[PDB]
Structures are given as C-alpha cells and as structure tokens.
C-alpha cells in the first residue's frame, strides 16, 4: 500500500500547522492509515473465520514492513510511503475481494493510494483424506493413547506445504509434536519426538499396504 502526498519541500519550507490527512509528508498520512487498517484487521479475522472438517480457519492480518524514503537523505520528506501487508485467506476467499476492502479503507480517509498485490497463493482443504486420516488415527491412539483432537486454529490458518500437495491432488495433512514456532515454542521434549517417529512409522505400515 503506497500512499501519495507532496509536494516535496526542503525542511525549512515545510508548511505547519496542517491536518494529518492533509500533510505533504506521506509518512504522516500513512501513520493515520495504519490505525484505520489495524481496526479493519481486527474485524477481518472474525468476519472471515470459517470452520472446515480439517480445522477452523482464523485468517489474520499483519503489517510486516514499512518504508519511505531513504535514511541517508532526510532533508526532504517523502512524497510517497509504502506499507506491506500479510493477509491470510481462508480457502474460499478471492484475493480481489480483500484488495477492494483495503481500497475502501483508504477511500474512507480521502487518501490517494496504490493498493498492489505482489503475492497470491491459495489455501486448500484436503479431499479424500480418510485413508491417511485413519491410518494416522490408528497409530496416534496406540502411541499417544486417546483419540486425536481438533487442531488449534493458528496451525490451520497458516502456510504449510500441505497446500501444494493438496493443490496437485495428493491428499495431505500436517502432524507433529510440540507447539508451533510461530507461537513461539522454542523446544521439543525428546520423549515426544520419539512418539512422533513411532506414529510416522506406524502410519506408513498401514497406508503403504493398501492397494490404490
């Protein structure tokens, strides 16, 4: 998201006082856009929460980077300033819909901006997962002792490589020990790692002996 302003002025000529949204300094305007975008994000994750058999997807939003202009030439404030947003999608959300929502936040503030997508990947729920699901379930109850529980939302609402497999028709799930690093967990119990390796092996012995 690049917000435009201007005209550029050498610091001894900058007009003051001026309303934030009218500032010639694009950094100043962006700061106002950021709090509007944070509230939009607060409501986004709730509006687009969606439950699937494979888990509940809670799609979140973060502002991951900002810049404008360059640190080694600061005697003129920037005519532009960019923000970089990570916006997670549930499998059923079109990226263009999200872009218009953001274009609208900007429009409500009366700002001139460019909202440009530079990454798009689709999320998927597995189709025909039952054989792997079952093979794993059997192994899990043997090694861990109880039925499996429904996954925590953050671990359903990220990017993991189940997506490429699913996209290409290889039914796929994710499973391992410990809390996610995004959490952030910083360790594994050696005993749990051993448990997992056992589950992985058992899963293989079931599944790899079926005829396709």
């Amino acid at each position: 998201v690049t917000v435009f302003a201007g005209p550029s002025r050498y610091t001894p000529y900058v007009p003051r006082p001026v309303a934030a949204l009218d500032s010639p300094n694009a950094i100043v305007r962006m700061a106002k856009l950021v709090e509007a975008l944070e509230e939009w994000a607060d409501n986004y994750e709730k509006r687009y929460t969606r439950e699937y058999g494979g888990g509940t997807v809670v799609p979140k939003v973060a502002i991951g980077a900002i810049r404008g202009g360059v640190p080694y030439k600061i005697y003129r404030f920037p005519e532009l300033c960019s923000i970089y947003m990570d916006i997670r999608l549930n499998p059923d959300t079109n990226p263009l819909v999200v872009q218009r929502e953001v274009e609208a936040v900007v429009s409500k503030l009366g700002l001139k901006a460019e909202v440009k997508p530079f990454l798009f990947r689709r999320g998927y729920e597995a189709q025909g997962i039952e054989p792997l699901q079952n093979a794993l379930e059997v192994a899990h109850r043997e090694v861990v002792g109880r039925p499996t529980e429904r996954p925590g939302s953050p671990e359903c609402s990220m990017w993991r490589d189940t997506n490429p497999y699913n996209e290409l028709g290889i039914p796929s799930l994710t499973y391992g020990c410990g809390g996610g690093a995004g959490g952030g967990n910083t360790y594994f119990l050696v005993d749990d790692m051993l448990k997992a390796a056992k589950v992985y092996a058992m899963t293989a012995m079931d599944l790899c002996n079926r005829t396709p």
């Binding site: 550029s8 202009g69 360059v70 640190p71 080694y72 030439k73 600061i74 005697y75 003129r76 920037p78």
Partner: protein, 209 residues
C-alpha cells in the same frame, strides 16, 4: 569610472552566461556523484586563466578553488556555490516522478532558464564565474584577491547506520574542507538563491534516529 567598463563588458557576456549555466546544469551531479561537474568547472576556470586546484577528500568528489589575483594590499573576497544537486534519478523513494525533467535537465526557454539543477546551484555559480571573467578581461583594478570556490557536498545528505563512507558523505568533505585547506579569504559571498535579499544568519541542525 573603471566600473562602467565592466558593466558594459557584462552586457556583452549574456550568451556565455546562458551557455555556462545550461552546460553546467545539464551535468548529472546529485550529491555523491559531483565529480563530473567538478571537472567541468575546473576546466572552465583553467581556460579562463584562474589557475584552479582540485581540493578534495576523494579523487571523484572534490572542491575546485581558483583565484583572480590582486595587485596587492586589499581585502580578499570569496565567491561560493556548490556543485551537487538535489535529485538523483535513483530517488524513487522520495519523489513521485523521479524521472521528470525539471529534476535532472537544464534548458533555455523564453527568457528563462529551467531546471532545479540551475536554481540550486549552477546557477548562481554561473553568475559569478562570468562576473569573475568580466573583471579579469576588462582589466579591472583590484588590490585584493578574488577567490573562486566551487564546492562539493553542500546538500544535507549524511551517513547513518549501514550507509557509511564515500557514497553518503556530504558537508564534511565540502566547503569546510576547502576552507581548512587553503580557500581562506577576508570575506566570503555565498551565491545561492535569495530574492536579491542578503542573509547572514543561518541555522544549525540535529538529526535524530
């Protein structure tokens, strides 16, 4: 009067003034790459017999100092303008239109000369380069020296964080370096744009991260 002779000399140099300003403003010279512009001014001063020297910290970013020597017994006057310009074609992060025209070129239209490179500062520099030429070539009587000081790095670029050294230095290697290394005189007129209004106070600055 020996003054009027110079004025009529200057009336005849309108064309060299224009040409010098345009040729000079046309040179790519944002802060950090003022070498080529320095070279032009050096060679200009040499042709006109001002005996120039390159005074600098780097061989491609330097100040140019030459003189119009006096008969003896007078006060020295410096004329000062800077060789660097504001916009680099690089700067897409500060300007909406980094590659306009007014940002990088310089041309004579109507009775004007256009280009940021001319207003700041190639510009007032052309004005006194010509003025110096008129005085010399009109054989004006001067007891004191006229010092011609063309500097690099006037504009407020400064190094910070990981941006260090040659590419980001400015004022530390500009005028104060020239003065500390010979370019001294009794008085100094800095030729930049006011509206024919003299100023002799200026501000300091502190940069905060």
């Amino acid at each position: 009067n020996d003054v009027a002779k110079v004025m009529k000399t200057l009336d005849g140099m309108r064309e060299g003034l224009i040409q010098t300003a345009v040729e000079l403003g046309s040179i790519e010279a944002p802060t950090g790459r003022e070498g080529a512009a320095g070279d032009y001014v050096y060679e200009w001063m040499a042709r006109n017999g001002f005996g120039p020297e390159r005074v600098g910290v780097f061989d491609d970013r330097f100040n140019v100092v030459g003189r119009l020597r006096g008969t003896g017994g007078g006060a020295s006057l410096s004329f000062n303008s800077h060789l660097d310009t504001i916009m680099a074609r690089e700067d897409t992060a500060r300007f909406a239109d980094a590659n306009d025209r007014i940002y990088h070129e310089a041309w004579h239209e109507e009775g004007r000369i256009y280009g940021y490179s001319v207003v700041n500062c190639k510009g007032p520099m052309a004005c006194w380069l010509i003025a110096a030429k008129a005085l010399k070539e009109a054989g004006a009587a001067l007891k004191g020296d006229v010092v011609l000081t063309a500097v690099c790095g006037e504009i407020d670029c400064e190094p910070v964080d990981e941006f260090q050294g040659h590419d980001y230095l400015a004022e530390d290697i500009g005028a104060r370096y020239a003065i500390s290394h010979g370019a001294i005189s009794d008085y100094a007129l800095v030729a930049e744009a006011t509206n024919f209004k003299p100023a002799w106070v200026e501000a300091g600055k502190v940069f905060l991260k």
